[PDB]
């Protein structure tokens, strides 16, 4: 039930709602924001030239084994990621690893 506040399953896959902090020591999940319903993700990339977006997508593509696109928030800290062709059950399993 922990990550469920940050996810919903559409016909296309799962929209994972995140809030990023760039120039981190490691790209990783550090928590959840219970009011915003977003996973707190640290991203080990500078927020310039799209590099934090790229690193974020790379991390989740590797985690989920699925294409990940930013559907909203390309220029925001609050980003919605579509994990294409995956179920919510599969995403929860991988986030809980
Ligand atoms: Na960026």
UniProtKB/Swiss-Prot annotation:
Gene3D superfamilies: YggU-like. GO terms for cellular component: cytoplasm. SUPFAM superfamilies: YggU-like. InterPro entries: DUF167 (IPR003746), YggU-like_sf (IPR036591). It comes from the Archaea. PANTHER family: UPF0235 PROTEIN C15ORF40 (PTHR13420:SF7). Belongs to the UPF0235 family. This is UPF0235 protein PF1765. It comes from Pyrococcus furiosus (strain ATCC 43587 / DSM 3638 / JCM 8422 / Vc1). The lineage of its organism: Archaea, Methanobacteriati, Methanobacteriota, Thermococci, Thermococcales.
